[PDB]
Amino acid sequence: SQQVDKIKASYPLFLDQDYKDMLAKKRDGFEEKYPQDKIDEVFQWTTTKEYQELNFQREALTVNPAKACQPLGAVLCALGFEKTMPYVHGSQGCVAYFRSYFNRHFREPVSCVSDSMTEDAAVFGGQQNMKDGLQNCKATYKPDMIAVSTTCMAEVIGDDLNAFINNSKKEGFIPDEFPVPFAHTPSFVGSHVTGWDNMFEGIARYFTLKSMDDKVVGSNKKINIVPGFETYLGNFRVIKRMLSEMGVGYSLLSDPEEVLDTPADGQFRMYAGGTTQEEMKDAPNALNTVLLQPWHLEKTKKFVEGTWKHEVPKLNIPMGLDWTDEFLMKVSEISGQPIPASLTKERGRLVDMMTDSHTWLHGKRFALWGDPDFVMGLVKFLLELGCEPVHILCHNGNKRWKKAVDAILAASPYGKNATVYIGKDLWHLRSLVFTDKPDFMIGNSYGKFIQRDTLHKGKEFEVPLIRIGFPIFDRHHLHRSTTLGYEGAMQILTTLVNSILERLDEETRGMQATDYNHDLVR
Amino acid sequence: SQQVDKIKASYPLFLDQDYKDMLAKKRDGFEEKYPQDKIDEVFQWTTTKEYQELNFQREALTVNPAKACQPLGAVLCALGFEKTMPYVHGSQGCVAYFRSYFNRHFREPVSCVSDSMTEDAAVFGGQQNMKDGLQNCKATYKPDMIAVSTTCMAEVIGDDLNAFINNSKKEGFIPDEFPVPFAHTPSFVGSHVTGWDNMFEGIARYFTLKSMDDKVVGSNKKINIVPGFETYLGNFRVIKRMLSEMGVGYSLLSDPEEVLDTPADGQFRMYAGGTTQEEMKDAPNALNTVLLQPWHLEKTKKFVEGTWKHEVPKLNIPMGLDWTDEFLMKVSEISGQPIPASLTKERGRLVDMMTDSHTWLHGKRFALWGDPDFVMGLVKFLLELGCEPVHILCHNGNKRWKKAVDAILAASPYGKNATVYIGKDLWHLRSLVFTDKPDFMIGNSYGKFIQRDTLHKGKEFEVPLIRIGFPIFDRHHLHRSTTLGYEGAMQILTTLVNSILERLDEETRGMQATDYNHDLVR
Amino acid sequence: MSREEVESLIQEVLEVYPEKARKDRNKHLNCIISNKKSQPGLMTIRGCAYAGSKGVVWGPIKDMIHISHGPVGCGQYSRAGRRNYYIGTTGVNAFVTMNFTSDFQEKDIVFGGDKKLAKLIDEVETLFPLNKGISVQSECPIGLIGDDIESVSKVKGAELSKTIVPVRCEGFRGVSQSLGHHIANDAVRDWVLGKRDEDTTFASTPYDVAIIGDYNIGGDAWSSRILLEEMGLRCVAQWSGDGSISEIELTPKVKLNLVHCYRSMNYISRHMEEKYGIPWMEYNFFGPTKTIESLRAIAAKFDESIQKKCEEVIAKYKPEWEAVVAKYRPRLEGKRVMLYIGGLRPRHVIGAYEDLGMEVVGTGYEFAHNDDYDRTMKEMGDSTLLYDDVTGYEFEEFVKRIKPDLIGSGIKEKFIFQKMGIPFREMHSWDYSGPYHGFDGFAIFARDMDMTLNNPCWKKLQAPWE
Amino acid sequence: MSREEVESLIQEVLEVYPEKARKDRNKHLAVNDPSNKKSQPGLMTIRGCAYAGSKGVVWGPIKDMIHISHGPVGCGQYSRAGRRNYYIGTTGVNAFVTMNFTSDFQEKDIVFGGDKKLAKLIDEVETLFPLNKGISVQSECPIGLIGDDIESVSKVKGAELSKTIVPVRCEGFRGVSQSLGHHIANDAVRDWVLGKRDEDTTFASTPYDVAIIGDYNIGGDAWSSRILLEEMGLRCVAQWSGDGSISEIELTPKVKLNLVHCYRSMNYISRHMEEKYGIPWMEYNFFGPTKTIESLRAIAAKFDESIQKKCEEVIAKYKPEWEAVVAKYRPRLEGKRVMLYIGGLRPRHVIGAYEDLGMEVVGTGYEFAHNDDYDRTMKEMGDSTLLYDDVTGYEFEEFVKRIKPDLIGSGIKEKFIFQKMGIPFREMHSWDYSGPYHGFDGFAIFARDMDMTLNNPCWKKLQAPWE
Numbered sequence A, B: 001s002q003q004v005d006k007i008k009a010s011y012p013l014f015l016d017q018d019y020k021d022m023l024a025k026k027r028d029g030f031e032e033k034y035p036q037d038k039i040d041e042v043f044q045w046t047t048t049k050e051y052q053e054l055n056f057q058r059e060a061l062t063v064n065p066a067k068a069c070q071p072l073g074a075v076l077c078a079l080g081f082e083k084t085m086p087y088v089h090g091s092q093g094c095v096a097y098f099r100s101y102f103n104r105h106f107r108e109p110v111s112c113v114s115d116s117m118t119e120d121a122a123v124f125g126g127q128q129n130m131k132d133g134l135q136n137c138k139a140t141y142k143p144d145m146i147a148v149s150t151t152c153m154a155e156v157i158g159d160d161l162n163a164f165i166n167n168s169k170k171e172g173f174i175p176d177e178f179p180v181p182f183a184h185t186p187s188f189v190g191s192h193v194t195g196w197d198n199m200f201e202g203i204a205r206y207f208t209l210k211s212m213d214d215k216v217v218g219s220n221k222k223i224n225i226v227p228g229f230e231t232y233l234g235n236f237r238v239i240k241r242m243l244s245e246m247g248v249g250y251s252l253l254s255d256p257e258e259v260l261d262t263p264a265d266g267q268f269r270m271y272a273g274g275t276t277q278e279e280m281k282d283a284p285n286a287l288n289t290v291l292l293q294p295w296h297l298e299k300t301k302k303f304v305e306g307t308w309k310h311e312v313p314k315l316n317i318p319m320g321l322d323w324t325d326e327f328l329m330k331v332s333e334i335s336g337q338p339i340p341a342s343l344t345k346e347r348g349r350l351v352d353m354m355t356d357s358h359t360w361l362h363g364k365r366f367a368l369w370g371d372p373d374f375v376m377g378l379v380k381f382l383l384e385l386g387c388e389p390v391h392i393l394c395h396n397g398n399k400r401w402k403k404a405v406d407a408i409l410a411a412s413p414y415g416k417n418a419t420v421y422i423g424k425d426l427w428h429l430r431s432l433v434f435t436d437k438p439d440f441m442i443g444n445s446y447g448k449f450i451q452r453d454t455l456h457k458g459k460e461f462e463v464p465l466i467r468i469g470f471p472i473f474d475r476h477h478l479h480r481s482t483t484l485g486y487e488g489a490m491q492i493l494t495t496l497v498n499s500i501l502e503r504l505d506e507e508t509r510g511m512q513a514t515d516y517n518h519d520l521v522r
Numbered sequence C: 001m002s003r004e005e006v007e008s009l010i011q012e013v014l015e016v017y018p019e020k021a022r023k024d025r026n027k028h029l030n031c032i033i034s035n036k037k038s039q040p041g042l043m044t045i046r047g048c049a050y051a052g053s054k055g056v057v058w059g060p061i062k063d064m065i066h067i068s069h070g071p072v073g074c075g076q077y078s079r080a081g082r083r084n085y086y087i088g089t090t091g092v093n094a095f096v097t098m099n100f101t102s103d104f105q106e107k108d109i110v111f112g113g114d115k116k117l118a119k120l121i122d123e124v125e126t127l128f129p130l131n132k133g134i135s136v137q138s139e140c141p142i143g144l145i146g147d148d149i150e151s152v153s154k155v156k157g158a159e160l161s162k163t164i165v166p167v168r169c170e171g172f173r174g175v176s177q178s179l180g181h182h183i184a185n186d187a188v189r190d191w192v193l194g195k196r197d198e199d200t201t202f203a204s205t206p207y208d209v210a211i212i213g214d215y216n217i218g219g220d221a222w223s224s225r226i227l228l229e230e231m232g233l234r235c236v237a238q239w240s241g242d243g244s245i246s247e248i249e250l251t252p253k254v255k256l257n258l259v260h261c262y263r264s265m266n267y268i269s270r271h272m273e274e275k276y277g278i279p280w281m282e283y284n285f286f287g288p289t290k291t292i293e294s295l296r297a298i299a300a301k302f303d304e305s306i307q308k309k310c311e312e313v314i315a316k317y318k319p320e321w322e323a324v325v326a327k328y329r330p331r332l333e334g335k336r337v338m339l340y341i342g343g344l345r346p347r348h349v350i351g352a353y354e355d356l357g358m359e360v361v362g363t364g365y366e367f368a369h370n371d372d373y374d375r376t377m378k379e380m381g382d383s384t385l386l387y388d389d390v391t392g393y394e395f396e397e398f399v400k401r402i403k404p405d406l407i408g409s410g411i412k413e414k415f416i417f418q419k420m421g422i423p424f425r426e427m428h429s430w431d432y433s434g435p436y437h438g439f440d441g442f443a444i445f446a447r448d449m450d451m452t453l454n455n456p457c458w459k460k461l462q463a464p465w466e
Numbered sequence D: 001m002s003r004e005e006v007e008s009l010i011q012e013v014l015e016v017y018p019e020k021a022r023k024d025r026n027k028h029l030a031v032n033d034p035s036n037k038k039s040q041p042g043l044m045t046i047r048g049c050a051y052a053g054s055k056g057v058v059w060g061p062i063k064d065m066i067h068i069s070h071g072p073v074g075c076g077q078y079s080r081a082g083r084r085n086y087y088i089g090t091t092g093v094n095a096f097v098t099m100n101f102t103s104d105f106q107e108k109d110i111v112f113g114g115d116k117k118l119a120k121l122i123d124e125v126e127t128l129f130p131l132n133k134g135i136s137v138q139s140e141c142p143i144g145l146i147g148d149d150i151e152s153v154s155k156v157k158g159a160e161l162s163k164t165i166v167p168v169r170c171e172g173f174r175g176v177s178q179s180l181g182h183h184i185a186n187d188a189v190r191d192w193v194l195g196k197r198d199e200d201t202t203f204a205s206t207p208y209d210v211a212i213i214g215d216y217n218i219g220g221d222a223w224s225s226r227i228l229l230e231e232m233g234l235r236c237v238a239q240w241s242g243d244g245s246i247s248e249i250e251l252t253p254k255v256k257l258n259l260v261h262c263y264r265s266m267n268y269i270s271r272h273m274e275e276k277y278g279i280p281w282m283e284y285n286f287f288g289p290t291k292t293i294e295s296l297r298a299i300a301a302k303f304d305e306s307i308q309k310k311c312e313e314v315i316a317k318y319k320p321e322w323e324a325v326v327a328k329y330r331p332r333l334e335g336k337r338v339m340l341y342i343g344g345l346r347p348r349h350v351i352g353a354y355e356d357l358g359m360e361v362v363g364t365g366y367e368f369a370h371n372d373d374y375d376r377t378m379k380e381m382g383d384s385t386l387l388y389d390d391v392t393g394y395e396f397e398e399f400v401k402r403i404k405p406d407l408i409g410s411g412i413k414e415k416f417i418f419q420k421m422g423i424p425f426r427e428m429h430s431w432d433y434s435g436p437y438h439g440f441d442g443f444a445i446f447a448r449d450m451d452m453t454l455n456n457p458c459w460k461k462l463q464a465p466w467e
């Protein structure tokens, strides 16, 4: 039943008595459900140290992973170039999924095509698909560039991307000089970050490998900035803003920030902004190239150093106070630009916020996850805030990375109770927040299911999620936030203190019970 | 008792059984407390429509006000000028309170003096206080200017500020040329906002009145912007930003941005930035003067029109979509500067966020409060979002204002369930959120006690607070936010949709009970 | 928009294509062909056979664990994408919103994943004891590399007395989600549906039915069921929407199969008829008109008692749905909708729109077959636009000319049309609202179309200085 | 830093003042060798007013009475919730501490008087808040200046309604600081509340009844004091203004001993209960293990053997606990130097807790203390440590710059100044939203808080690596 003035959606419609009754009958007759007492028993079992030890012995089953596959990152990389269509050669299922996943995170259109390889192509390869594909795409969506990646079908059957593209040119389907960089992006190797790295380096190679004879390291007096897999608009934005106010000439390779934020003014723009082909070609003439997310830009490093002959500075991701300082000073060094008074002050304001908020943040315990560069930057900042990064999980992290982070931890009394986990997933993490309960999780939206589980054990065991990372699907417009620089530090700091203070207000909102400590001033 | 590795603060130390017993014994033994059943009965009674009618008949008693007194605003106005000391002539207790109240909201130092009128000045006046006060302040704190305001003591005894200041100059306590603008700021007339207006008008008069004979309206080619009582640093910065984007020469009168946000770099800066005395002198030469918050700037308007000869435009506070549009177009008009591409984009990005978030915002019911301008802008914006500003409360609002707002409401289908209250307070509002339950409140920290009251009735009756306003003391650094312009509209939207979604996540976080609607994607 | 006008639009749009594509796309634009391969490079909105099997048919089955077998992408992007609602304790006895995967690395591609699948079946069994069965949803590589998920299922299943269903729904098979459904229907038939063929323990009644192809999107199956039981019938099973394994096994005992989604479920229905004599019928629970028409048709199949109760129900909800039309119809009257969804909804919601006085001026499907289009021409108006497997380019160009007042399609379409100024509602996920089924569903559906189409934001797309 | 170093520092600082201010301020700054004057205009005193002392401090904490900030809206708004006087209650029903009740004077009330408005309000309070057990009217500046007679109204309305209505003439122009507020408040309790049960033989007194006088329960400070006295066999009949009730106050004349924590704010009433009821009073200190221990022992000594021995048990019980907190914090804080500036008690009383953590107090001072407070202080400070009464903002900033203490403990108006200078700051009024600091349990929190701030990683990050 519905009241026309007060219509109930699913919640709370199905709490209505007649539905409650209807669902009770459905269960008891037909579902053959395990009895609730057994359900409860198994649930408590799943919270134990005993369960954890078995959970951590998994070799074959992954449950609730905290990574995606390569071509996703390739697509994101590709969308960062001027009037470029991302093109994933292989089966279409993947493309529907890549587009949807980003559509949800950004709440924006996400344009990408497939060549739609089927069973037939599995036996005879995907050449004709590449031929008609490129031609069709070029004519229909009129990109200036088509950036090709692969799905696991195409990888497994071994299609030679290079030859296929070359034969499409030869055979007249696309002009010889139409830009078609490619990269092989196997889903069974690494993760989405790896896909970004491969794609970037394919595009870099495509535009520079032949032209190297006229290149003078430094002659355009710019610094190149390679962002990596980046899903916060504020991060692209803050890097540009800081470099500009410093008067540093720069060239943000692969920038998607316009095409991921296009005004609702009566038009759909398929393409917007992005790094120009001219910038990719001119890029070896830069003074140097800075990698913002070095732990997933290995191949890109090798190429930039090996072929462009740039001495890539050893900088961490510019997250937290120290790494933002190091970043600005390295940039100052290369550019000959001083760090302006405005940046010096912004940093001061940041440290101000730390002094004001330290008493609440002190010793707060966190479980956290995400990509390797993001996670270490956030570990770093937590330590600087006087917080303890107790559970640090990076599903797609590697052994060298785990060492680097363990060294960061080792240098702080706040790192003493922290453990880094590589190759582990969120169902592992769900055991860790039960058996060694932190105060908060810092994570992406998949974390909500862990909070729900902790809550179910009891209010006093609930670990609230603080949404930082990718993907964030169950809140709106957080993709517009910043996590890099002083600015990003200020935002994270505010989100953390305030999450702590909201939680305490919840805990002290009990009239005549806990309210004694429901202070107006904190 | 404490366990040295897990030290407990008040919460939850006093939840320990021994404390619990001790408190129960205290009560039973000595407090003669009303029985709990009586208390419950009275609590339920205080939630009824019957309590409400009676609550609304109050004529003499005010309970939990949503305003403060005049000199508070006068002090805030004064801090906006270059190297200026706010000085309140009267009793010192007032200055301790003004400085603490703002200290709590900004987390910064708030510098302000008194001339410590005692018992004796109550009989013979506070002349010697002004004489020694001015001299002492000038010598000790070395301001370029002293901005004189008044406490109710000095108002009731009718001290002639003007005479006293002239006599101080005349007796040589401070040099003749030293700027000592003044204003009478009585705590028993209007509110804090009035004190801002009075003070600004005092300062404008001081630098301008006896100089008008050489002022040509338009020769400096600028627009003056008078912010009014403003406690979000963002609002200050967003204005200047937008005008700079337009290439519009401006002269923001009363900037307290810098001095309310000094860096923590090893030194305390007592003064910082602010409007220069030269800007104030030149202010008549401007093309025109725009009042960002015109409902508490009536005196300033009369002075700017009457003496500067500026045709102050009929603009609402630049809050929300339409009013930011009007602001920009008026500025364009006056300055002959076209509204640039960047503001057009930014506006459409706000509109885009609107389209993305409309389904969660649709029909949400709000109770809200604050100063008159702030409230009407928030009302406007809520209507633009398709929300219902059901209880609109402005303790310090006036009848004409109320009329203006009821007009705004009449112009939208979303105003049909809305009522504006002037002269009413947070205990009044408390009734309204029980008897005509909205979904959320939008207000300042005092709101927390209302949310606590609603929760006590039951979870289904809890009305969550969204902290927007002044003062905000139980969260950190929200004073950095923006509520004006497209930027401010973006922040407010994000905060509204996410408060809705988070509340929904809370309600749907019941394992096997409500978590059927605990969607990953929203 | 006239017919010569429509045909003119069709031809104009097609002229951007290279000839090969142009000739094929012309065939797919009231005749029409469907269920053919997508033209490469043209930004199809379609998914794969895996989406059809794991995403759509199997995924909802709450008490089994569904293994996304292959690399990490597929399982991840489909984790809780679909609002298939269930009651249960997730992670203990229910598992729908979890992502289980064999997360293939290179070693598994080069040597095969059959031993890793055997090892993970053991691990699933350790860590999730209350599971009632496992299905194994193959992703692209499994067949390509020559694995035998059948032997693993049969061996391990025998070894553990547990139903393990191998599903060959690799994304390279078929042309869309559609073949996924069929592969999934055949996997139920071969590994689940016959399990209780020797069982006489279930007391059937003359009023046993089952809901076939309601995936309970936002509770849609629940708001459907209620009405059928308020009409006297007993819903023994709901197929794949809050669906449990025992339900599916009990489906052989029912008197009648109530097919909502013909496209995805007809296969298993036809089979149940052949093997068990159980007849099946199609219905529609979208809008008052259809639900009324349906309740009656399903009732007329039984006798009088069920027919009186049907008429009771109808009267019992007449106040409610009439209040809804009274409120909402004057707000939505004569507004024009263009739709694009999967294999059912593009025809099935037409009536519900018409009950609010709206006209569907365009509709089309991702993966329908010709039998679905036969059904579709009856519901659509004379001279309206049909599009099968529309391309991104086509849909944009059609909307620019048709200028509909509302568009009802998926997440990949949503933000495009919103930027164009056209009210958009997601008619897969119901934009996180719903249910839209039944009379209670109609109420919400009506509120949602109005809130969006009559939203104040659409007045604001143009800057006043422009 | 030595003797004539502190003396030359003082002169250096005073050089900036005009002669009159110079001469006065000179008398208010001393160097130690083991007050109560007007503030000089324009020098940015940290002092508050008599209203702060009466409403904010003494009456405000009283749980079950409604207190009316009578006059304009300012005073009551800025003080609303301002202070962390903790309490158990149902706020808005039987308890009212965090609410702001006001007569909200507008110009018609200034011009014609608020006594009529006050009578109306009292009725409004009565209809809307029927569980209130008494009312107090805290006069703001205008009430006395305007010539109202809140006493008449209080007697009349009190009579009519059979309520205890206390008029309090604590207008901010009276006295020189919040100190005279305490005294006015004490006298108002005396005159209008404390005598009510003089003729009640009905209270079953025991030989162990005590009252906690002058503990306003900041962050629960009184609660962590009580527990200890209760464990030692005493009965606390009353807690004076910290989770306090009116009945507890009315019962306080039945007790055997008044235990005074805050001498400054409540010596007046203690003296009176001595004269009138014969009840003796004694001063005690519950900051840190050392002071708590000797206090428990001095209090126990006032009673019979059973109490002396429960005392020894209590002391033995907490021994391992307090001894552990030090072993953990002591090594982290020893030798650090603290400068304090607080109100009328804590500048002296918070020295022993610091010393239990191996810290030294190199400077201390009070806003509003009298010379009996300074007599008590000199006993507690080292030779050559800096003493400052009613310090100016300027003086304080300058003393800090020279002395360079490792930690400063003061109020909210001082906090952000020193934090920007890079000196770790702890609020020593609001216990910086932490606490309690009283008793053995309060020592653990105090230790943890001094450590977390003073040893916070943020203080190393002030100067940019490039300047």
Ligand code: ICS
Pocket (backbone or CB within 6 Å): C052, C056, C082, C177, C215, C217, C261, C263, C264, C341, C342, C343, C344, C345, C346, C427, C428, C429
């Ligand atoms: S199953 Fe089909 S695409 Fe029949 S694969 Fe798809 S929950 Fe659509 S038009 Mo998403 S044939 Fe269901 C469908 Fe329809 S996922 Fe849902 S909305 S009624």
Ligand code: ICS
Pocket (backbone or CB within 6 Å): D053, D057, D083, D178, D216, D218, D262, D264, D265, D342, D343, D344, D345, D346, D347, D428, D429, D430
């Ligand atoms: S009452 Fe006094 S100023 Fe003794 S007015 Fe003040 S809660 Fe201070 S040094 Mo704030 S004489 Fe109490 C005090 Fe001490 S408010 Fe508190 S901390 S022990």
Ligand code: CLF
Pocket (backbone or CB within 6 Å): A069, A070, A071, A091, A092, A093, A094, A097, A150, A151, A152, A153, A186, A187, A188, C048, C049, C050, C051, C071, C072, C073, C074, C075, C138, C139, C140, C170, C171, C172
């Ligand atoms: S069509 Fe369909 S979705 Fe595609 S893969 Fe094939 S089944 Fe799967 Fe390897 S690349 Fe990544 S992982 Fe999967 S998404 Fe692709």
Ligand code: CLF
Pocket (backbone or CB within 6 Å): B069, B070, B071, B091, B092, B093, B094, B097, B150, B151, B152, B153, B186, B187, B188, D049, D050, D051, D052, D071, D072, D073, D074, D075, D076, D139, D140, D141, D170, D171, D172, D173
């Ligand atoms: S010393 Fe005097 S008692 Fe003390 S605090 Fe001052 S008023 Fe009040 Fe003032 S703050 Fe404003 S100006 Fe009139 S109302 Fe309230």
Ligand SMILES: [Fe+3]
Pocket (backbone or CB within 6 Å): A106, A107, A108, B352, B353, B356, C415
């Ligand atoms: Fe968007």
Ligand SMILES: [Fe+3]
Pocket (backbone or CB within 6 Å): A352, A353, A356, B106, B107, B108, D416
């Ligand atoms: Fe600060």
